[PDB]
Amino acid sequence: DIQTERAYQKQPTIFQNKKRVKLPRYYKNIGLGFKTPKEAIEGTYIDKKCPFTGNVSIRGRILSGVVTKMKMQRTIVIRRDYLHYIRKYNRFEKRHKNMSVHLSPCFRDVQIGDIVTVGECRPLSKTVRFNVLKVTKAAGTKK
Amino acid sequence: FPMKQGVLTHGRVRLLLSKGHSCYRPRRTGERKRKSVRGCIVDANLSVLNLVIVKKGEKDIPGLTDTTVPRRLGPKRASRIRKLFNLSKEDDVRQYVVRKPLNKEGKKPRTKAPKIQRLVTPRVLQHKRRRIALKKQRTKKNKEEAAEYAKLLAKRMKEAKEKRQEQIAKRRRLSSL
Amino acid sequence: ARGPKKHLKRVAAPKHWMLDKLTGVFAPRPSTGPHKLRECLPLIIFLRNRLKYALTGDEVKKICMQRFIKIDGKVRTDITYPAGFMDVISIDKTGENFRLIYDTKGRFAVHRITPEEAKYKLCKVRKIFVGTKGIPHLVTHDARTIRYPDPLIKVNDTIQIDLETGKITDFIKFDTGNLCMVTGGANLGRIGVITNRERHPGSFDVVHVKDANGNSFATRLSNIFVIGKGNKPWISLPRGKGIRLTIAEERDKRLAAKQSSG
Amino acid sequence: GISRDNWHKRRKTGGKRKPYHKKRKYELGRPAANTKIGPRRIHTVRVRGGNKKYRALRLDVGNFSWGSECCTRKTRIIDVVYNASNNELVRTKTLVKNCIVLIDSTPYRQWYESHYALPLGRKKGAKLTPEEEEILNKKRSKKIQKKYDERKKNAKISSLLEEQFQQGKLLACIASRPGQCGRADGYVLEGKELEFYLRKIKARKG
RNA sequence: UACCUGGUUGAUCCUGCCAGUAGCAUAUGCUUGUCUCAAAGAUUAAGCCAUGCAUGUCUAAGUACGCACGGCCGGUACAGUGAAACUGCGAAUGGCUCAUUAAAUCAGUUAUGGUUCCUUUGGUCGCUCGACUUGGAUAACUGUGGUAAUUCUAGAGCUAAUACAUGCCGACGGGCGCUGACCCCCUUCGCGGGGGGGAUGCGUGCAUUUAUCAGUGGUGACUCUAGAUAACCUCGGGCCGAUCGCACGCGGCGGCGACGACCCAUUCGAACGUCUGCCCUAUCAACUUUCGAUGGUAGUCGCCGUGCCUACCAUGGUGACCACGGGUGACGGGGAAUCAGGGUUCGAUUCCGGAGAGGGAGCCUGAGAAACGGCUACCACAUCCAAGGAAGGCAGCAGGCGCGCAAAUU
RNA sequence: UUAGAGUGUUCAAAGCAGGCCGCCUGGAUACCGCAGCUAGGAAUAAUGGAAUAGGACCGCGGUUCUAUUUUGUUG
RNA sequence: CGCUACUACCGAUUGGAUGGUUUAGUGAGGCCCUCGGAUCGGCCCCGCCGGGCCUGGCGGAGCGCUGA
RNA sequence: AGUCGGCAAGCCGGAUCCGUAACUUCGGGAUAAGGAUUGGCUCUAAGGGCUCAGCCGACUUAGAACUGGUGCGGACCA
């Protein structure tokens, strides 16, 4: 399950060594009407970069994209498609920008093609600067 | 090239000298520089040696044991005067100052007295009486404003509850409608 | 650069100072103070380019070192002091009191006020700080940290402080119906009633302001400054009353004034 | 000197950046403190803004806290037993944040035996000779007895926790960054966290 | 003003280019009376530089025993100017240049709830439980000197602090929590239960570090602000005033300032980040990676966020929507030239931003510099020498050389 | 800067001034794409919904925990 | 094919030259750390004493201690 | 430079980690060329059987610290 690292990982705020005779998970409201998912409150995972159970504050911009890869752990890369307008030829051109977003494990089931809504936060790594806020399941794909 | 104390050689070396070292005077603040200073070990490769007599012998040299030049200036700090003339912590100290009569051509003889520093004067006590008065008004201001504010949120005490006295009073009237 | 800036070029100065670009290369760099460099007005400009009391740069320095200009109950001797918005500039020699409030344009108007109105001024609170021992604080828009305020004075209100005593007397709550004095942007200098408030979580909240003549405009909440209850202000307004008559009417108003006096 | 910049390394695609400005002062990095155990030796360094950081180089005492008991006493550090980051930091005993250290139990045992006055530690067969802690056991007033003996409701401590009170060494975790704050503070391991590191410590023996 | 004409043919109609035509700068030639504006060593050589100057600064208010001048009412010290020196502040702005640099710089847009900030402004500054003013150096100055030579300094006598150290009475008389000697009241056969006070000692301000406990005031959202408890308090120690000038009125009390600081705001910023945007090139199609490439965990360092770095793991990341590589006679932008409508070309150049001071590198001081009209190296170049050494940085203003088609007054 | 309002710099290029026998006024305005923010429109062009119904509504019945208002106060 | 001129190309020469980027060695200098301890202090120690254990002066040595 | 002629002698040498051209029958060239490392000692990590824990078992690789007059394929082999 959890505690698969050298250090004992735990939510740094809650105190789990009160004298007795389960555990009070910590989770915060994220704001902007984003409903904290059920598993972020009932699940027992521990991630410091989760927007619901970690020390990251969502701010700045709120974008959206589509998932393309998940081989990276705790992190996926989405693809933002847009149309750049060139003045001379009064036309457009498809352009794409793939960015790496942190996927907190509160979103258990999410596949390639699902549309996620990301939110800017402080730099989590060398390239990651966004966090997955909500996951809209792809078109159809009810099977 | 002068010789720096404690270098343990007789040759010559170059050293980074800073604020505090010898043989160097910094121009800008925090400036350092290389300087070729000579070793401390005395040898034949010197031009001058500065010697200072520690204990005077039995004989008397006509050059240094002869001409005595008195102290250039007297003590200037007030406390240093008390230590010089063996004076008490209470007696006057102003008349015990070492003044010097200055005499030259073209001017009539005056006598110059240095200004005694760190001496207790009523100007100081007037200065000391002022800051403690400022300490008084601050304490006064703090107890006044906090107590004034104390009755003021208490002015909103019965102003905040008396409105909720109307909120649940309708909550029972809303139940009977 | 390798540190903070200290000069200001004559061209890069804010335009509402109305500095001509033929006199000198530089501009009076406002020393740091209670207002930002853009919204401020260096008193070297208020005396040389607004009242024509002085002519050169040396001349205002001679004036200010006479201990003659009293800003908000305090006398300053720095010519580049940033006299911002609603700073009462009182002068004891001529017995005159000035209050820096915006013209209907973007410029600062030279408002002459009666002396008994010069002993107070309005300020916009910015946040409600809580001191290290449960001591409430508020910071006005001119950086006046006033401790022990009234509990009801919230973040976006205005307060009527008295200059000589530095104490709050009364405050206007921010809500629809109160007057406002837009300070910054396109509507800088408009005076109207507030009709609607639009919430935008995270971004800036925009507030709709109806003028006295019914041409309603909109501005973000940061650039708004209430000045009065209902439609009657607490400050003496300049000419125009902050309406910004359209450019069609500055032409007929000016041309009617030509042949009216002749 | 050693700088901590982003532009000296490759881009996300893998392309090489080309530096457009030489090393800047605000991108400074300093040599690591690598504080050890021993008599207190702290060098203060001036940092950005005319402030000071405290480079602890050798530390012996530390203000550790006992969570469940809501107690904390400045005890002396004994040894470094475990380090998640680098296995070489326990060999060369170095104190950095989040390190399992050993501290003396006496500043805590004498508290628990003054608040609860029970036989904490003290393996059976030998008794206190100076008789001072015996003064802590008896001669209470009858009125104060009933508030004292109701402290026996929560006088129990974990079997794992009292076991290391026999040796007099408690396992504590460092919480302050000593190469920055100059102090080496922390808390006492308890419950699952204590039970976890014991599994990681014994597994090192083999 | 959305415009064309000559030239292939024996002649014709075409395709089609060549040549005319008009701006716009750069040079150049010839010529030149007045007057108002005004660019001007960018292009080649970010090549090299003689000389001169370009950053210093004193108020009544930090230190005044230089008669260096100078007042006489002096013995109650210093009239009052004041060179010098110490101290404080600034020297990190400005000015110059465009070599580097192709999602970099830069622009618009936002974030700092991820950080620092001299100064200004406004708050704070007898909360903390034990002196009517403390300590010893040093400069100027006197004298003795050295070296061919410098804004080189050595030695000896003195002598100041708002320099450098040290440190208190007062507020302070008790309060508030913890130890609690002990004492008192009711009931109980009785141990028992409740209601109390309480000597004595201890801890008791903010800031710092860590741990734990409840929701004064906040935000869209805090692990926020405030509150409580247990401790910690860096000797290369966080403050809590051993300063200064004018009036002076009532044992001592009072005005007006100046300076000084801890801390919070504020201003000035700075520093990183978000989204979108950049020229030519495929005779550049794959690139990056245990020499960090992409993530995870824990740290180290840093003002802070982050592979910034380290350890241990994972095997990723980018690309035909042009990655990567190369070129640029590429600083970016606001803009400029030229146009009917579209465009094309330029932007070294006075505004903003960046970069750099011969080339790289390292660093002191400070709030702020990887500073160059600051240091330390090496490389290149070059000056003075007594041959031992010393000293240098015009892409500042002038000026000279060089270079050139090409650019002004020491 | 460009466009552009006002203004006899003797005109103009300029400049931001100036005008009346102390007063009277100016120092406007427009455009500044592309991206981002705000409000309206719903043609056009994309995209989605329920056909193994895990569909929508309407009331339900049970299960688990929980704000509690309540049990006069003390559990 | 032959004459003349010019511009590019192939070409032995492990051709040459000038830039750029570097691998590896050696590595100045600063910075940090661990030491170092020149030199400068003060305390303590007693003897000689003037004032009523405290003080001012004279010398010493352990450098016994401590600090830079 | 000796000599007809580098004859003879010498240099090179193992392994590990890097790196490797012309040319080519595409297989090669190739141990191309050219570099770096190598001792002793004290440790850490990883790699298995038998009944989560306990009990047995072997060798081998990588990394780190310390250390010696920079010496370490110390002879041999090459």
* Residue carrying structure tokens 């500065």: B50
Q: Looking at the structure, tell me whether residues D66 and D97 fall in a common domain.
A: yes
Q: Which strands, in side-by-side order, build the sheet including D36-37? A: D36-37, D51-59, D41-47
Q: Does D38 touch chain A (CB under 8 A)?
A: no
User: Rounded to an integer, what distance in angstroms lies between the CA atom of residue C113 and that of residue C237?
Assistant: 9
D14 & D1 share domain: yes
Give CA–CA dist A39/A45, Å, rounded.
9
C201's tokens? 């979580």
CA nearest to A20 within chain D = D154
The radius of gyration computed from the CA coordinates of chain D, to the nearest angstrom, equals 23
User: Where is B15: in which H helix or E strand?
Assistant: strand B12-17
D87, D174: one domain: yes
The nearest alpha carbon in chain C to A32 belongs to C201
The distance of C168 to chain B (nearest Cα, Å) reads 12
Q: Do A16 and D84 touch (CB under 8 A)?
A: no
Strand D51-59 and strand D36-37: the pairing is parallel
Q: Which residues, 6 or more positions from B100, have their beta carbon under 8 angstroms from its beta carbon?
A: B111, B112
Which of C137, C138, C148, C165 to mutate to test binding with chain B, by most B CBs within 10 Å of its CB? C148
> How far does CA C106 lie from the centroid of its chain?
11
Which method resolved this structure?
Answer: cryo-EM
**Side-chain-side CA neighbours of residue C192 (13 Å):** 24
If we measure between CA atoms, which residue out of A42, A40, A39, A16 comes closest to residue A28? A40
- Give the whole-angstrom CA distance, residue C50 versus residue C19: 11
Residue A129 to residue A59: CA distance in whole angstroms: 11
Pairwise CA distance, residues D106 & D64, whole Å: 13
Q: Are D196 and A8 inside 8 Å of each other by CB? A: yes
Task: Please give the distance of CA C244 from its chain centroid, rounded to a whole number.
Answer: 17
Give C169's contacts (C-beta < 8 A, 6+ positions apart).
C120, C160, C161, C162
Decide if D196 and A5 are in contact by the 8 Å CB cutoff. no
Size of interface A-C (CB pairs under 8 A): 6
The number of beta carbons lying within 10 Å of the beta carbon of residue C83 is 25
∠ CA D59-D60-D62, nearest 5°, is 90
Q: What is the distance between the alpha carbons of residues C72 and C79, in angstroms, rounded to a whole number? A: 15
Resolution in A: 2.8
DSSP C138-176: EEETT--EEES--TT--TT-EEEEETTT--EEEEE--ST
Q: Which residue has the tokens 């469940």?
A: D68
CA neighbor of C124 nearest in space, from C101, C100, C81, C154: C154
Residue B161 CB-half CA count within 13 A: 5
Give me the DSSP letters along chain A.
----SSS----SSS---PPP----------STT-PPPTHHHH-----TT-TTTSS----S-EEEEEEEE--SSSEEEEEEEEEEEETTTTEEEEEEEEEEEE--TT-----TT-EEEEEE-S--SSS--EEEEEEEPPSS---
Give whole-number Cα distances, D126 to B130, D106, D122, in Å: 68, 17, 7
DSSP-based three-state secondary structure for B86? coil
Q: In chain D, how many domains are there?
A: 3
CA A115 to CA D130: how far, in whole Å?
Answer: 74
Rounded Cα gap, residues C158 and C175, in angstroms:
11
Are β-strands A130-136 and A115-120 bridged in parallel, bridged antiparallel, or unpaired? antiparallel
User: DSSP 3-state assignment of C2?
Assistant: coil
Q: Are residues D181 and D79 in the same domain?
A: yes
Q: What residues have CB less than 8 Å from D196, skipping those under 6 apart?
A: A3, A8
Interface A:D, Cβ pairs < 8 A: 31
Burial of B74 per CB tally in 10 Å (0-12, 13-18, 19+): middle
User: Same domain, yes or no, for D72 and D130?
Assistant: no
What is the DSSP-derived secondary structure letter of residue B2? -
D47 and D130, same domain (yes or no) = no
Q: Which has the closest alpha carbon to A79: A103, A105, A106, A114?
A: A114
Same domain, D101 and D185: yes
8 A C-beta contact, residue A77 and residue A118: no
Number of H helices, E strands in chain B: 2, 4
Q: What are phi and psi of D2, to 5 degrees?
A: -60, 120
Beta strands in chain C (DSSP E): 69-71, 74-75, 88-91, 96-102, 108-113, 120-127, 137-140, 145-147, 158-162, 168-172, 179-181, 191-198, 206-211, 217-220, 228-229, 232-233
Amino acid in position B120: V
Which residues have a Cβ under 8 Å from the Cβ of C49 and sit 6 or more positions away? C17, C18, C19
Q: Please indicate, yes or no, whether residues D132 and D177 belong to a single structural domain of this protein.
A: no
D72 shares its domain with D131:
no
| Chain C interface test: which of B143, B149, B151, B158 (most C C-beta within 10 Å) | B149
Closest-approach residue (CA) in chain A for C199: A32
CA B127 to chain CA centroid, nearest Å:
18
CA dist., res. C237 & res. C212, Å (int):
13
Cα D158 to chain centroid, rounded: 19
Range of the domain at D163: 106-168
Q: Are residues D111 and D138 in the same domain?
A: yes
- Chain C residues close to B155, C-beta within 8 Å: none
Where do the DSSP E strands lie in chain D?
Answer: 36-37, 41-47, 51-59, 61-66, 71-83, 99-104, 169-174, 186-188
Could you give phi then psi for residue D152, rounded to 5 degrees? -70, -10
C-alpha–C-alpha distance, residues D40 and D57, integer Å: 8
Residue C166: left (phi > 0), alpha (psi -120 to 50), or beta? left
The shares of helix, strand and coil residues in chain B, as percent rounded to the nearest 5, are 35, 10, 55
- Considering only residues 31-50 of protein chain D, which place a Cβ less than 7 A from any atom of strand G? 31, 41, 43
Asked if A75 and A105 touch (Cβ cutoff 8 Å), the reply is: no
How distant, in Å, are the alpha carbons of C99, C184, D157 from that of D145? 74, 72, 21
CB-based touch C/B (3+ pairs, under 8 A): yes
In this complex, the answer to whether residue D58 has its CB under 7 A from any atom of chain G, a nucleic strand, is yes
Residues D85 and D187 in one domain: yes
Q: Which letter, b or e, does each residue of B10-25 get, where b requires 16 or more Cβ atoms within 10 Å of its Cβ? A: eeeeebebeeebeebe
Closest by alpha carbon to A58, among A79, A37, A17, A29?
A29
**Residue C28 tokens, joined:** 């009076």
Q: Tell me which H or E stretch contains B14.
A: strand B12-17
Name the β-bridge partners of C198.
Answer: C206
A119: phi then psi, degrees, rounded to nearest 5: -140, 135
Integer distance in angstroms from the first to the last C-alpha of chain C?
57
Do D35 and D101 sit in the same domain of this protein? yes
Rounded distance, CA C96 to CA C113, Å? 8
Phi, psi for residue A7 in degrees, rounded to 5: -90, 150
Residue B13: its H or E element: strand B12-17
B114: amino acid identity, one letter: P
* CA separation for the pair C110, C95 (Å, rounded): 15
Strands (E), B28-145: 33-38, 100-102, 110-112
- Kindly list the distances between the CA atom of residue C142 and the CA atoms of B64, C79, C158, in Å, as whole numbers in the listed order: 72, 18, 12
| Nearest-CA distance A112 → chain D (Å) | 22
